[PDB]
Amino acid sequence: STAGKVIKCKAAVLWEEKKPFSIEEVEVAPPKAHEVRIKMVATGICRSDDHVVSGTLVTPLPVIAGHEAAGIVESIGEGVTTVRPGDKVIPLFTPQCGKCRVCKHPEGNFCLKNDLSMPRGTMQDGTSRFTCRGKPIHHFLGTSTFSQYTVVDEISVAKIDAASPLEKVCLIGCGFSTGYGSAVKVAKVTQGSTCAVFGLGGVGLSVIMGCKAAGAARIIGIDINKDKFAKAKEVGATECVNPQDYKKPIQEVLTEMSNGGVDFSFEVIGRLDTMVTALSCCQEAYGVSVIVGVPPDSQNLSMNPMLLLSGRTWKGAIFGGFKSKDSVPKLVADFMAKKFALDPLITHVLPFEKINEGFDLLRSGESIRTILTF
Amino acid sequence: STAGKVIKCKAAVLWEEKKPFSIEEVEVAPPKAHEVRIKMVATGICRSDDHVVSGTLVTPLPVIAGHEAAGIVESIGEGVTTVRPGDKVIPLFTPQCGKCRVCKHPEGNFCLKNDLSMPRGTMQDGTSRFTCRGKPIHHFLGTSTFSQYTVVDEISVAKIDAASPLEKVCLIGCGFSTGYGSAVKVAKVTQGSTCAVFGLGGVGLSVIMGCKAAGAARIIGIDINKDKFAKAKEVGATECVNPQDYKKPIQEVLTEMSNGGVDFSFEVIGRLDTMVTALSCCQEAYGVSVIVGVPPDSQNLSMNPMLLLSGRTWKGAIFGGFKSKDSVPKLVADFMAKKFALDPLITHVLPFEKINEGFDLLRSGESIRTILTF
Ligand SMILES: NC(=O)c1ccc[n+]([C@@H]2O[C@H](COP(=O)([O-])OP(=O)([O-])OC[C@H]3O[C@@H](n4cnc5c(N)[nH+]cnc54)[C@H](O)[C@@H]3O)[C@@H](O)[C@H]2O)c1
Ligand SMILES: NC(=O)c1ccc[n+]([C@@H]2O[C@H](COP(=O)([O-])OP(=O)([O-])OC[C@H]3O[C@@H](n4cnc5c(N)[nH+]cnc54)[C@H](O)[C@@H]3O)[C@@H](O)[C@H]2O)c1
Numbered sequence: 001s002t003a004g005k006v007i008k009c010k011a012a013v014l015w016e017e018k019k020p021f022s023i024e025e026v027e028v029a030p031p032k033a034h035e036v037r038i039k040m041v042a043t044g045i046c047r048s049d050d051h052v053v054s055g056t057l058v059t060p061l062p063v064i065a066g067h068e069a070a071g072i073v074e075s076i077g078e079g080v081t082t083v084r085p086g087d088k089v090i091p092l093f094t095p096q097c098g099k100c101r102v103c104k105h106p107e108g109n110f111c112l113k114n115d116l117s118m119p120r121g122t123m124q125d126g127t128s129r130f131t132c133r134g135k136p137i138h139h140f141l142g143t144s145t146f147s148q149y150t151v152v153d154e155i156s157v158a159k160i161d162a163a164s165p166l167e168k169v170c171l172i173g174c175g176f177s178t179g180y181g182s183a184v185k186v187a188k189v190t191q192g193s194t195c196a197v198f199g200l201g202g203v204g205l206s207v208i209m210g211c212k213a214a215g216a217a218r219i220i221g222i223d224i225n226k227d228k229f230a231k232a233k234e235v236g237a238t239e240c241v242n243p244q245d246y247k248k249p250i251q252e253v254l255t256e257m258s259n260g261g262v263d264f265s266f267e268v269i270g271r272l273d274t275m276v277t278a279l280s281c282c283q284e285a286y287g288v289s290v291i292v293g294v295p296p297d298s299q300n301l302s303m304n305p306m307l308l309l310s311g312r313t314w315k316g317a318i319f320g321g322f323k324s325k326d327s328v329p330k331l332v333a334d335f336m337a338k339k340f341a342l343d344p345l346i347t348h349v350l351p352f353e354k355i356n357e358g359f360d361l362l363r364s365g366e367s368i369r370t371i372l373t374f
Numbered sequence: 375s376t377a378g379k380v381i382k383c384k385a386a387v388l389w390e391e392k393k394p395f396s397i398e399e400v401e402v403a404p405p406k407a408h409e410v411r412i413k414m415v416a417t418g419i420c421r422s423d424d425h426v427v428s429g430t431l432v433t434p435l436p437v438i439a440g441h442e443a444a445g446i447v448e449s450i451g452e453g454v455t456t457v458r459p460g461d462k463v464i465p466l467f468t469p470q471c472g473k474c475r476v477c478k479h480p481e482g483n484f485c486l487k488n489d490l491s492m493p494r495g496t497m498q499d500g501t502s503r504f505t506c507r508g509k510p511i512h513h514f515l516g517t518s519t520f521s522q523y524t525v526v527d528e529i530s531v532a533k534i535d536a537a538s539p540l541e542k543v544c545l546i547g548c549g550f551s552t553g554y555g556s557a558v559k560v561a562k563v564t565q566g567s568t569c570a571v572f573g574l575g576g577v578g579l580s581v582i583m584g585c586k587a588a589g590a591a592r593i594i595g596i597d598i599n600k601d602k603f604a605k606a607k608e609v610g611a612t613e614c615v616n617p618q619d620y621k622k623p624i625q626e627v628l629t630e631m632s633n634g635g636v637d638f639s640f641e642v643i644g645r646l647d648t649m650v651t652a653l654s655c656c657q658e659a660y661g662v663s664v665i666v667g668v669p670p671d672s673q674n675l676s677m678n679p680m681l682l683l684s685g686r687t688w689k690g691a692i693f694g695g696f697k698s699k700d701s702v703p704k705l706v707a708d709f710m711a712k713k714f715a716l717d718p719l720i721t722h723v724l725p726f727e728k729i730n731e732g733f734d735l736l737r738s739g740e741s742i743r744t745i746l747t748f
């Protein structure tokens with residue numbers, strides 16, 4: 001009975017940077033042509049959502065953030081062919097339009113319809129489906145999952161297995177897939193190699209999972225929070241190092257430990273300095289370094305291009321390099337077949353209403369992923 | 375007979391930066407164990423040699439520069455097994471020791487025995503074979519080809535076809551192989567792709583040759599000297615553009631020309647700004663940019679890592695990525711089998727005694743390669 005009607009529901013609205021979310025009533029318009037309205041079931045708290053709050057990642061405010069989630073289709077707009085009401089779905093923060101030059105390219109995944117490069121905070125048609133206190137509210141990355149209901153473009157949703165546990169598979173919408181793909185797809189980590197992973201949060205742990213799945217012999221985790229080391233070892237780190245323990249810069253330490261540099265390094269934090277350190281610590285002639293972390297808005301790094309001239313490869317990726325709509329259902333199917341584990345990433349569970357406590361847990365260093373249930 | 379004896383011969387000594395070469399008598403010691411003394415036949419003038427003069431590339435002075443050459447073995451030290459007196463050879467400015475982790479890696483070529491990273495200007499044993507006016511003179515990259523005779527370590531020399539024309543194949547010692555390999559091996563240019571080549575000197579032309587050999591559909595040459603365009607088109611450029619002709623930055627122009635960014639870009643100049651421009655003009659999700667130019671000593675570039683996070687790959691290489699001792703003989707064989715051309719790169723042929731005139735032709739923009747003949 002809600003099809004074609006405005007839904008009034010609770011969402012977590014971010015009115016201002018550096019402030020708590022406000023859990024309050026919003027109006028969610030019905031889906032227009034090629035749009036899908038989703039009843040959310042679970043959403044994860046990713047550091048990128050916190051970047052919205054801190055101004056690290058600039059997107060228009062006020063906003064409904066959230067991008068790592070799973071839910072059930074409530075209704076579909078005219079012309080939608082890929083999902084139906086009642087289907088389990090994961091919103092895709094990187095769309096897959098299937099039509100642009102990137103979508104057509106065998107390697108590419110950063111579809112040109114994305115709202116990450118130059119965020120507008122709208123639907124594809126340049127408008128918003130959200131009203132709060134009578135005011136229009138921005139979308140985030142075409143997903144906006146911190147709401148009991150959201151509306152997404154069809155190119156920003158994937159149908160997943162009907163028997164999927166949504167409180168787990170939501171992590172396939174961002175943190176797991178990003179880290180795992182960064183290792184297996186972007187870096188193409190090789191059997192017997194030595195990897196260095198900077199940052200041992202949910203995404204970095206997923207990188208470790210991918211490096212172990214790819215057969216790396218050594219996986220060195222690097223974090224300034226030694227509380228992160230036990231879980232990193234559980235999921236495959238062979239050793240962990242805290243830069244604060246050393247007199248020398250950590251790129252030197254890692255070069256020494258790896259007898260001349262690592263095969264693959266990953267920056268999974270979001271700092272300009274660690275991006276350069278991670279490049280430097282890979283072997284100068286054949287090493288590969290992948291940037292995963294999101295840097296502070298509009299800031300440039302400084303580096304010596306001799307690091308590249310000797311033979312290093314430097315790359316980055318969004319969402320692990322995965323073409324989103326093709327890949328998410330397959331990743332869920334693989335999860336259901338026990339090909340990888342998600343539980344190691346889930347440290348806390350809270351109701352959606354305790355979203356602010358969830359962010360407190362992330363900011364204190366205590367959590368990896370908190371999953372919020374609607 | 376000269377074997378076992380000091381040779382007094384003519385060489386071009388660089389006594390200090392930013393001065394002409396001094397053409398005068400030097401003494402060349404006989405080769406020690408695992409060393410090879412070569413009578414030079416032809417040597418090219420590479421921009422990297424000019425970088426030694428200009429202080430762009432730092433290496434100990436005084437020095438016998440020159441690294442792109444071909445000659446004939448005069449004698450061998452004890453224990454040499456890979457060349458014999460009378461063999462045609464190309465000195466290898468990047469060695470191939472065959473033993474280090476890089477030499478053993480399938481994709482590495484920047485052998486750890488190189489003298490490029492931390493130049494000492496000596497033989498592998500830390501001593502010099504050259505004296506001039508009673509003073510020791512440094513080697514350059516283990517080669518020192520601006521001399522009628524040089525001494526090189528065995529790991530820094532390759533035997534080539536006895537029927538080779540040395541006045542042409544000397545280019546395989548640096549500029550040809552560097553450009554060609556940067557395209558075919560390091561970038562792995564694909565059939566039907568669009569490439570952008572910044573800098574249309576000898577190395578850039580060789581990058582164009584490689585892009586064409588790989589089947590690129592479009593090859594855009596970029597240079598501030600429009601006199602370089604005719605030859606660039608002869609060897610495969612489909613379009614040429616001069617940044618000075620445009621009101622907008624050339625990365626914007628190139629992005630527009632390529633309907634959203636090129637597949638492969640190459641920096642073949644040695645400027646920090648063009649390194650960043652070249653990265654920026656490749657497609658943000660799947661583009662690849664290769665740094666070939668040598669930048670000014672100790673200077674860092676500034677760049678926004680979002681350029682990489684979207685999906686770009688940035689890499690550099692020495693000597694086109696080629697494992698030097700394995701590759702040089704095969705390249706010469708390929709040249710003899712007419713698989714590529716070298717004549718388009720050679721604009722001037724001068725006696726060795728005219729080295730300074732050869733450098734003046736480079737600096738003025740008038741030459742591609744001058745070959746000096748002994
Ligand atoms: N490329 C993508 O598509 C993508 C997707 C998901 C997340 N991200 C980004 O990836 C990064 C990690 O996300 P996350 O795992 O959720 O975050 P997180 O849980 O905050 O983990 C980051 C880790 O970095 C550690 N850390 C902080 N400073 C340093 C330092 N100087 N040296 C070493 N370790 C340090 C910190 O202790 C923490 O455990 C963030 O910047 C995200 O915005 C990118
Ligand atoms: N990586 C290696 O192993 C390797 C080997 C050989 C050469 N190099 C370097 O490659 C570079 C090219 O060498 P080369 O071809 O002998 O030099 P070159 O013949 O001087 O060619 C450089 C070209 O760049 C052009 N140029 C200068 N400034 C600009 C600009 N702003 N925008 C566009 N074009 C510009 C210039 O007009 C010239 O045609 C030099 O830096 C060499 O030191 C590197």
Ligand SMILES: [Zn+2]
Nearest residue numbers: 097100103111
């Ligand atoms: Zn697309």
Ligand SMILES: [Zn+2]
Nearest residue numbers: 046048174175
């Ligand atoms: Zn995320």
Ligand SMILES: [Zn+2]
Nearest residue numbers: 471474477485
């Ligand atoms: Zn070696």
Ligand SMILES: [Zn+2]
Nearest residue numbers: 420422548549
């Ligand atoms: Zn050179």
